[PDB]
Amino acid sequence: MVNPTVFFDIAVDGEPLGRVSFELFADKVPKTAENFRALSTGEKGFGYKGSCFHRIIPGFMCQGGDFTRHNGTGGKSIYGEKFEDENFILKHTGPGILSMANAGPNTNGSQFFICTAKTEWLDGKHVVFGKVKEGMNIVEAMERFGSRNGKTSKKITIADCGQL
Amino acid sequence: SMTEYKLVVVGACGVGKSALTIQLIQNHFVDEYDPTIEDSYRKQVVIDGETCLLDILDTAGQEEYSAMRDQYMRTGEGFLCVFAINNTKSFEDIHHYREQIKRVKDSEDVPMVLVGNKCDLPSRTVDTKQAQDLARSYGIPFIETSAKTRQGVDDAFYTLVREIRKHKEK
Ligand SMILES: Nc1nc2c(ncn2[C@@H]2O[C@H](COP(=O)(O)OP(=O)(O)NP(=O)(O)O)[C@@H](O)[C@H]2O)c(=O)[nH]1
Ligand SMILES: [Mg+2]
């Protein structure tokens, strides 16, 4: 079957910025792709809609996905609070890579990051499971709101999200 | 005239590096955890009758980025090595921080203070005696703190300043 595509409509203090769409590599990372897909549609009764990109560090990545604590510490998967690292087949080769954030081995939840540069030192520690399809210019625009410690100068949110 | 001190706060994730620093700088505590990337603060204080400008680098409890962490250690003059009294792994982690600091600064005599934080909590796993003995083996002070109640907070940072001053004036 074909890899699913999901979208985020990004807002800045509630004003639309643009749409980012992602190809999810279900063909190579099915369990991790399925988690992100289901969190994007909200079909389990919880997910990304309304949550924030809480940590944006220019030159590195935009990180979000905490819909449970809303403070960068939380999140949960469709499989429970955490799930194991599925594989490390794919690498952090450049801008647009979509990868799981974690707190060490086998702690995937819902937090994720979009690379804005090659982050090869994360290879083998974070599971890569997708890439930006359309809207990299939106991701680049989100960087304007980050800083060296990741704090954002305006609220960058996933105002809407779903499956295409 | 005043004197300036470059202090660096290190220790495992969640032990209270930021809560200690924020209590010193801003005189408040919050139970909400905001994981650190990197933050720096400046505050003027009086220590032993002398005016002191404290530069505090609050580091993250991660170990991955050795190039950056080594530069923190090269620039820093004194190190607050923090563990939590209810986190035995964090206490076991202490010797790694001391070894890294000695390696980077190429010295067996680096100003440092061992801090056992969260002493207000009822869930202690590390005995005070064990930490006292470790500090003695290193030749450095040991101070028990609580960022929540402010116990020992000034004492920990001011003792570190005194250790830098003694080292520089040897
Ligand atoms: N009861 C109590 N809680 C404390 C104390 N110090 C810190 N905490 C709590 O422990 C958690 C982590 O504290 P924090 O200062 O963020 O730790 P850190 O060492 O800076 N973490 P990091 O490495 O991620 O930057 C917070 O919820 C904070 O409120 C303390 O002395 N007593
Ligand atoms: Mg901190």
Side-chain angles (χ1 to χ4, degrees):
Chain A
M1 203 80 271
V2 71
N3 281 341
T5 304
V6 296
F7 75 91
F8 288 175
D9 288 324
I10 301 296
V12 176
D13 292 338
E15 286 291 341
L17 182 66
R19 175 168 288 197
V20 181
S21 68
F22 309 93
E23 182 184 349
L24 308 179
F25 301 138
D27 51 354
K28 296 177 185 169
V29 208
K31 188 173 164 192
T32 308
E34 171 63 12
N35 181 60
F36 191 91
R37 187 202 65 74
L39 292 175
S40 296
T41 66
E43 64 194 61
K44 308 297 187 184
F46 50 86
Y48 294 131
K49 189 165 175 176
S51 67
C52 173
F53 278 83
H54 64 278
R55 181 187 290 184
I56 299 178
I57 299 183
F60 296 96
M61 84 293 156
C62 298
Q63 179 178 337
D66 177 1
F67 59 82
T68 65
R69 301 281 80 82
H70 313 273
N71 69 2
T73 68
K76 69 179 180 175
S77 83
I78 68 171
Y79 311 114
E81 290 180 9
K82 283 86 169 54
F83 66 107
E84 61 185 27
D85 297 314
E86 184 172 12
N87 67 59
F88 301 111
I89 290 165
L90 297 172
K91 310 301 186 188
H92 302 78
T93 52
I97 289 296
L98 179 63
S99 182
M100 290 306 283
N102 65 48
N106 306 307
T107 60
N108 301 286
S110 55
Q111 289 192 44
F112 63 89
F113 62 106
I114 308 167
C115 300
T116 58
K118 184 170 79 170
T119 62
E120 76 284 354
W121 60 90
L122 301 176
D123 289 352
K125 303 284 177 54
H126 296 260
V127 175
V128 172
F129 65 95
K131 66 177 173 179
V132 175
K133 184 179 199 73
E134 285 195 282
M136 199 60 209
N137 65 323
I138 309 305
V139 177
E140 291 162 2
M142 293 162 60
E143 280 190 302
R144 164 161 89 104
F145 305 104
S147 66
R148 198 173 163 272
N149 71 3
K151 291 289 177 179
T152 61
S153 53
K154 296 186 189 201
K155 194 116 197 296
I156 312 308
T157 59
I158 302 171
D160 201 6
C161 52
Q163 186 171 358
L164 296 175
Chain B
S1 59
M2 68 184 73
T3 311
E4 187 167 353
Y5 298 87
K6 290 184 287 177
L7 313 185
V8 179
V9 186
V10 305
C13 46
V15 296
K17 298 180 293 297
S18 298
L20 282 172
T21 302
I22 290 160
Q23 268 283 23
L24 186 81
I25 295 300
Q26 301 167 5
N27 311 282
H28 72 81
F29 172 83
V30 177
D31 238 332
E32 186 153 0
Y33 178 27
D34 185 8
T36 301
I37 295 290
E38 189 196 278
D39 290 286
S40 293
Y41 303 94
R42 288 164 66 88
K43 185 179 182 184
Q44 183 183 324
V45 301
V46 173
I47 299 171
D48 302 341
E50 308 290 349
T51 302
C52 299
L53 187 56
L54 308 186
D55 300 335
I56 306 174
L57 179 66
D58 183 18
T59 72
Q62 62 87 39
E63 33 255 30
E64 301 177 22
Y65 301 101
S66 69
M68 190 66 87
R69 296 191 55 88
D70 289 355
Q71 190 61 53
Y72 294 163
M73 295 178 179
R74 277 194 291 271
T75 296
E77 291 170 328
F79 303 84
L80 213 64
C81 297
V82 186
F83 70 100
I85 59 89
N86 65 345
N87 180 345
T88 294
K89 175 65 152 62
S90 76
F91 178 71
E92 294 166 354
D93 288 340
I94 288 292
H95 72 95
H96 293 142
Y97 293 99
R98 181 168 165 82
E99 293 160 16
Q100 292 162 4
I101 296 160
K102 291 173 63 187
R103 171 182 289 117
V104 172
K105 304 182 76 61
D106 188 40
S107 180
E108 289 204 290
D109 190 12
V110 179
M112 64 178 72
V113 170
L114 181 65
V115 174
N117 189 45
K118 312 196 185 185
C119 70
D120 58 283
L121 289 179
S123 51
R124 183 185 285 273
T125 64
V126 180
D127 299 326
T128 309
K129 254 300 158 54
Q130 195 183 358
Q132 295 177 324
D133 290 348
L134 188 63
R136 184 192 186 84
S137 79
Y138 291 163
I140 67 178
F142 170 59
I143 297 177
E144 283 208 337
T145 61
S146 171
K148 180 173 174 185
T149 69
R150 233 172 174 277
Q151 172 194 137
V153 173
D154 288 346
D155 197 21
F157 287 94
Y158 294 5
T159 293
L160 184 57
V161 169
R162 294 191 190 94
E163 294 293 297
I164 297 167
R165 181 173 173 194
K166 298 170 84 54
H167 176 262
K168 288 188 171 191
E169 281 184 299
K170 260 206 177 193

